[PDB]
RNA sequence: AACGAGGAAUUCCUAGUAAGCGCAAGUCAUCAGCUUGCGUUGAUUACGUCCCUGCCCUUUGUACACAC
């Protein structure tokens, strides 16, 4: 259901409804790890840190942003706080924070690196889905269900 | 040539306190004073290096540290100076235990040693001594530290032995037109001059010769009258 | 020589809005008296921490302004002055009193020195920021003061805290109220005349830091 | 000491400048300028206070003989201040200069 | 006691002052 | 009294410093070349220009 | 009947019900006009969506706001939300939506609370 | 007689929070010398760091690539 690239295109990740998110090589054509949940919930989207360290994925069913390490296949924690499914996720290429599009009509900014662990909500008009973020890493583009496309700033 | 003031009666100068941090004034602090109380049983006494020493031996402290006599005669020398009659200084006591006592410039200090010990042993337990005219309490125990209770435009120096000897006149006139001079003297017997080197920045000496605690504040305050032209 | 006519019908409302409000729709003014235009931060390094780019009517926009770390830099310093007036146990959680004090304060400042009361406040805040500051060292008892430089956000935060306390400590037990002494403190801070409490702490905290670099 | 406050408001004493200990007979504001107070006294000196600094006189205008009790400004030149004593000798003073002796 | 980065600094200062010491001595002879 | 405005190039990390002191590489505004390691006490982020009193001391570890 | 549109505003426990119909350009809150808001310092906070938009865009619309609940600061913040929502809901329904888009942009460039109210939700660490 | 905003020494606290204000109820425990709810007003300052004091973990990478 969602396919993304990371770390100069040598490694690559994919989320499915099977209850797993699977890394892949493009050099040896094989999986490294098959990360999974605690009970194999479904998956909607996938996002990766630009450094190949953290993978994350969102779900229709459990609606907690599970995160895994690339090295250790165990999941670190469940970044939760949403009402209804996290639709899309994306990591910032400079600040290294993730933005969550959810059916809570709220855009959540998670600063999960370096003792921060802080949660910043940006609530919008309607059911927001299909987030995207600039390569500059200071803006969030989102698509509401009402039709309009909103553009924010992550820091401000 | 210049017109006289409309009023020519002599009037009392204002009593400077820690509430006012504006006017140019003198601050003397008898730091590391040895003033603590202990119960004899039925009565409460000030610890002395001469009166009761075997009590201090059981407490583990040395006998020669507890010297409230030098702090007593420092107060009698400082508050009877003509600058106190001119109302240009206030004096604080910084004890060794961290208790900081503000001495108001109008108080008539008890003269003998036994009456002053009776005055202080009720000061440390009632936290203030009220006036006989019920106006304003003379000896008030105030909050730590001392640097917040000093005036705002502030100059902090200390009196030591190894410090360079400058004239007391030359330091006051080179001080600015509105800065308040704050001198932190050693009210203890004999030891290191590092009681308030955290607060002050340069140590200032008065003579190469050994000066007692009473005459150290007396020398510089008599330079204060000859520099502030009273 | 060139016109863009957007308004054709004379705008007359059935509810009578006074002309003091109607002339305010061109320039957004502070308290509908003082313009935010040409209020430029003269001294550098405090732009984007002292912000007056967005104009505000009344110093009361209670948004989300402490949840993020540096969201405090986005506050207009007229509002940052009102919010910092709660420095006691008696005036906590009374902002309509604190806004009314500042409205009286900017009235007195404009009457006395006639350029702009907001420009004085911008100049007064950017002056009394202590550009050098001291800190202790642990050192196993060697507690020597060591000079360290100061963040621009901390320069703004110390300036507003010292100017408010300078108003509150001066009208502690006096005949002057808080509105009169805050006008006296801010005007003296804008000149750098070394008679306000805030300027008197600016050079004192620097000279303590200047005593041991 | 002189006190200047806002019109239509007895409650808010805005400023209280302490002049010399002699009584002050006339306290006039500048006509063209709107931020400088000029007061006289029985101390035979006029003082020009900027209300920003209500503690130190900006120009201690001296040289008077006895009891300056009315002074006025001149609408053309802001540097010229007329000063009337109580023995004749109508002084005309300059505040752009040192301001201790009439022109 | 020290920290990495500070340990290399004192190593850098000691050796190169010795290196610049022998360099000026080589220019002497 | 020559003050020197200094843009922060990078807030450092994992260095020996006390609480309330963050070691920061600043860079002057007269040229874009010369960078000097200094100590900033308040809450400082990236790319805020900072007023230095003097401009030659080499700020060491606070111990 | 005449065209009409209705919006809602919300501060801490104060709600606002604003109805916007075509008319003579009059502004009403609780029967009283807008020149009588009782906190008396926040009266420029309820003129605030009026003067960002230009008074010509209110010259032909009517506004009637009821407010219940809250105190004084929470009540005034509810009125300025319901007027700003009420203006932008009239213009999206019977007037140009490019007019609505410039009306909406002039509010969100200023402040987001005029359009939708952020629920100050608790957070556990 | 005591008392003009409270000493040393300690304790708690990061946003609808601290603090201030009233109203209501008296829930099989507890509470009327009070307890519990519900509203109004609503800030400062960190939101970083392991330098100090503590507390815990790790010292075969084994969880599949690459890098190290």
Tab-separated table of C-alpha atoms in Angstrom, chain A residues 12-111:
chain	number	residue	atom	x	y	z
A	12	UNK	CA	14.109	0.881	0.142
A	13	UNK	CA	11.019	0.162	2.221
A	14	UNK	CA	7.446	-0.969	1.646
A	15	UNK	CA	4.272	-1.219	3.720
A	16	UNK	CA	1.545	-3.780	3.090
A	17	UNK	CA	-1.754	-4.905	4.576
A	18	UNK	CA	-0.052	-8.162	5.656
A	19	UNK	CA	0.917	-6.633	8.994
A	20	UNK	CA	4.534	-5.946	8.107
A	21	UNK	CA	6.823	-3.244	6.782
A	22	UNK	CA	9.690	-4.757	4.822
A	23	UNK	CA	13.046	-3.273	3.970
A	24	UNK	CA	14.727	-4.255	0.721
A	25	UNK	CA	18.062	-4.027	-1.000
A	26	UNK	CA	18.580	-2.928	-4.570
A	27	UNK	CA	22.084	-4.441	-4.612
A	28	UNK	CA	21.393	-7.984	-3.376
A	29	UNK	CA	17.590	-7.842	-4.021
A	30	UNK	CA	16.694	-9.151	-0.575
A	31	UNK	CA	15.009	-8.033	2.615
A	32	UNK	CA	17.097	-7.070	5.617
A	33	UNK	CA	14.355	-7.177	8.237
A	34	UNK	CA	10.596	-7.645	8.205
A	35	UNK	CA	9.423	-5.245	10.895
A	36	UNK	CA	6.037	-6.060	12.386
A	37	UNK	CA	3.598	-4.818	14.991
A	38	UNK	CA	2.653	-6.359	18.304
A	39	UNK	CA	-0.498	-7.948	16.840
A	40	UNK	CA	-0.090	-7.409	13.038
A	41	UNK	CA	-2.402	-4.476	12.432
A	42	UNK	CA	-2.877	-3.167	8.888
A	43	UNK	CA	-0.859	-0.344	7.320
A	44	UNK	CA	-1.765	2.736	5.278
A	45	UNK	CA	1.415	4.713	4.615
A	46	UNK	CA	5.144	4.537	5.225
A	47	UNK	CA	7.782	7.169	5.883
A	48	UNK	CA	11.522	7.016	6.474
A	49	UNK	CA	14.134	9.254	7.992
A	50	UNK	CA	16.576	10.568	5.342
A	51	UNK	CA	19.284	8.838	7.341
A	52	UNK	CA	18.617	5.112	7.289
A	53	UNK	CA	17.826	4.740	10.977
A	54	UNK	CA	14.072	4.961	11.674
A	55	UNK	CA	11.118	3.572	9.732
A	56	UNK	CA	7.522	4.439	10.605
A	57	UNK	CA	4.095	3.482	9.322
A	58	UNK	CA	0.469	4.335	9.950
A	59	UNK	CA	-2.701	2.295	10.121
A	60	UNK	CA	-6.449	2.326	9.633
A	61	UNK	CA	-7.025	0.015	12.582
A	62	UNK	CA	-4.765	0.847	15.528
A	63	UNK	CA	-3.972	4.506	14.493
A	64	UNK	CA	-0.737	4.770	16.445
A	65	UNK	CA	2.408	5.767	14.580
A	66	UNK	CA	4.614	2.743	15.185
A	67	UNK	CA	8.346	3.336	14.802
A	68	UNK	CA	11.124	0.797	14.310
A	69	UNK	CA	14.866	1.030	14.127
A	70	UNK	CA	16.558	-0.025	10.913
A	71	UNK	CA	19.265	-1.904	12.835
A	72	UNK	CA	17.178	-3.569	15.545
A	73	UNK	CA	13.954	-4.993	14.149
A	74	UNK	CA	12.081	-4.425	17.409
A	75	UNK	CA	9.774	-1.422	17.552
A	76	UNK	CA	10.884	1.446	19.769
A	77	UNK	CA	7.545	2.950	20.815
A	78	UNK	CA	4.079	3.869	19.574
A	79	UNK	CA	3.747	7.601	18.958
A	80	UNK	CA	0.072	7.957	19.835
A	81	UNK	CA	-2.389	10.752	20.452
A	82	UNK	CA	-4.651	10.637	17.405
A	83	UNK	CA	-8.372	10.067	16.974
A	84	UNK	CA	-8.829	7.985	13.859
A	85	UNK	CA	-6.334	6.765	11.291
A	86	UNK	CA	-3.011	8.380	10.552
A	87	UNK	CA	-3.241	8.732	6.788
A	88	UNK	CA	0.174	9.961	5.632
A	89	UNK	CA	3.579	10.468	7.238
A	90	UNK	CA	6.814	12.145	6.138
A	91	UNK	CA	10.148	12.941	7.794
A	92	UNK	CA	11.834	16.305	7.319
A	93	UNK	CA	15.086	16.156	5.374
A	94	UNK	CA	16.809	18.835	7.489
A	95	UNK	CA	15.166	19.199	10.905
A	96	UNK	CA	14.458	15.420	11.141
A	97	UNK	CA	10.923	15.684	12.507
A	98	UNK	CA	7.862	13.828	11.258
A	99	UNK	CA	4.442	15.172	10.327
A	100	UNK	CA	1.312	13.039	10.607
A	101	UNK	CA	-1.824	13.502	8.526
A	102	UNK	CA	-4.815	12.025	10.317
A	103	UNK	CA	-8.593	11.818	10.153
A	104	UNK	CA	-8.699	13.788	13.442
A	105	UNK	CA	-8.517	16.960	11.263
A	106	UNK	CA	-5.194	17.631	13.037
A	107	UNK	CA	-1.654	17.797	11.704
A	108	UNK	CA	0.725	16.491	14.358
A	109	UNK	CA	4.409	17.422	14.451
A	110	UNK	CA	6.519	14.907	16.372
A	111	UNK	CA	10.034	15.874	17.438
